Symmetry: C3
Subunit: 153 residues, 3 copies
């Protein structure tokens, strides 16, 4: 239900309170979580060999890199799903998000259920994209079952 | 074949009787079972009474009572039913509220039949994916068991 | 990887169409270009169905991308992903009204475009199989249900 997921999540949120709260919600549904208060922080953490399974990442990070610049810097050294966190959905922000990631965004106001559900869909989408025989196998099963079923008429 | 009996129930939550029936008729044509609630309050009462649709199509604006966002919150405490919002337009203020109460998106009031049915179908399989995943019930883990029993079953011939 | 999936690109600019076509070729998709919506409609009518259409919201002096998408919908269930420069509300509403498969920013990174193409391609295949019954989730429950009655009979 909210069992222990092996997935590691990196939160990139300058706001200490918003960072810690999101970490809390995820922690409580089973995710291993780390925080970075800046996009630069987050790049060092990923280039220092710690590879998350997902990045929740604010489009506003403050006076350094923003979320889009960090998403690209992260892209240079990794092929990790990035899901953006945003306060609002202005066209200028949505364009920026849809142009660096294929994995969408979550409102920082979202209910808890929404956040956790977007994170699972994102992790499952990414696994799907790293990959036929599924059809063949089923076909074998499908007639081997007919093989057997007819015997015990 | 896309019109076949879907074997799925849809709850339209929509105060305009004319709009609700127009959507019910498209959903029936493609083989869905349909229920209409003219208010959010009627919708909450349907589910907390024990009736569970497979998906909700929720207008974000519902007249004098709860609006669609409120309604969606109220149902989120009773079940995790997938809720797809109906909306006239895509102003950031509206899209902001929709995306904070549902992970299943929205459909334009002006969408075509095919866009409606495909969004509904897609939302239904998304939810089935998440429920299956909440339960360890991944399609490949079923494959291991089904093949393993077919071995066992096979050996049973002397 | 080398996919056996063919993508039709409907784009009035030859440079942009060829830019998109190069990227897709570099990842194993068979690609074909229509410079007008009138030509895309004739390919699908003349019986060349692609696996996905990448169509610019805005084309030439003929049909725009939305009208082209609506025509294709009269004769086919093909997945259509719009190319757009700007997600302004009026534009995003037109897009959301004629396709269930979303859009891509002209300025998207190459990884984003590619990923979106794979997702819309997978999604479309699921809907086709589900609507004709041939999806993997269903066929499992068909084997599981008959394998349950088979072994429940052996269990006696
Ligand atoms: Ca911030
Ligand atoms: Ca209304």
């Amino acid at each position: 239900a909210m069992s222990l997921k092996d997935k590691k999540i990196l939160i990139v949120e300058d706001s200490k309170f918003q960072a810690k709260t999101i970490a809390n919600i995820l922690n409580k549904y089973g995710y291993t979580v780390e925080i970075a208060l800046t996009g630069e922080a987050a790049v060092e953490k990923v280039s220092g060999g710690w590879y998350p399974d997902l990045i929740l990442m604010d489009i506003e990070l403050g006076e350094g890199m923003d979320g889009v610049q960090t998403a690209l810097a992260i892209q240079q050294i990794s092929e990790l799903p990035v899901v953006f966190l945003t306060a609002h959905t202005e066209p200028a922000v949505v364009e920026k998000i849809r142009s660096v990631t294929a994995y969408g965004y979550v409102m920082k106001s979202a209910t808890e259920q929404v956040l956790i559900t977007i994170v699972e869909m994102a992790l499952r989408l990414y696994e799907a994209n790293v990959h036929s025989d599924q059809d063949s196998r089923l076909k074998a099963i499908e007639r081997e079952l007919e093989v057997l079923t007819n015997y015990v008429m």
